[PDB]
Homo-oligomer: A and B are copies of this chain.
């Protein structure tokens, strides 16, 4: 393939569709987790060749991650950029929590990015080139009122990224993390009660920047670690949360 190839692990939700659009704008070919037919059509009109991978977007197994990485090599014979997000918010006071909740949040927030990096890193170290962005959470960077177990496991995910980054830095492969809070997408609006307009104003009051962030603006930020234009930073965590972190 003459064009660079990006893997977006999940295009069903959150920033996934917008990441694919940014990559198509940057002249990438794409391997996408479970893209809608419409998203595939849109990206193809932007001049991007698209290879959908179905059923492995939860990265719930080493096999799921390997299938996504293998799809890039099978289709295009290269993999230049790879990005994933995972996990669901778990809320409730520590003193009312259970060991089972901690185990469940660990799976989505740590096993998933573990599996992704275990599959993708060897592909890129072999090429002595590549950019990996692991989207964790801003909740990993600070104590998070009402989400103590969630915050704890997100911190492990971010530190895993920093550890992997340091281990492979000499190969030229970059591994970075970003993490959000107070973003405007369905799963958050439902969990936060933001869907009511009056409630959304209350949620905004918590945010220093007094608003929710967009998938569009977050996807543009993510390109700083994925579009190939900037290659001399690794092991970073950046919060994307309106100044909350």
Contact = CB atoms under 8 A, between A and B. Distances in A.
Contacts of A169: 208-210, 242-243
Contact of A221 (B163, B233, B240): B233
Contacts of A102: 110-111, 114
A151 interface: yes
B94 A121 contact: yes
* Chain A interface, DSSP helix/strand/loop, else mixed: helix
A104 to B, nearest CB: 12
Stoichiometry, as copies per complex, reads: 4
Interface stretch (A5-13, A45-53, A193-201, A223-231): A223-231
Interface of A: 61-62, 93-95, 97, 99, 102-103, 106, 110-111, 114-115, 117-118, 121-122, 125, 140, 142-145, 148-149, 151-160, 162-170, 172, 174, 183, 208-211, 213-214, 217-218, 220-221, 223-224, 229-236, 238-243
A242 B234 contact: yes
Most buried by B among A106, A140, A163: A163
Contacts of A159: 140, 143, 151-152, 154-156
B230 A218 contact: yes
A167 B152 contact: no
A172 to B, nearest CB: 6
A169 B121 CA distance: 36
B95 A125 contact: yes
B143 A118 contact: no
Given A62-B99, A221-B233, A165 B143 contact: yes
- Among A143, A157, A159, A236, max chain B CB count under 10 A is at A159
A117 B243 CA distance: 17
Given A95-B121, A165-B243, A221-B232, 8 more contacts: A93-B167, A95-B122, A110-B152, A143-B163, A151-B160, A209-B234, A221-B230, A223-B224
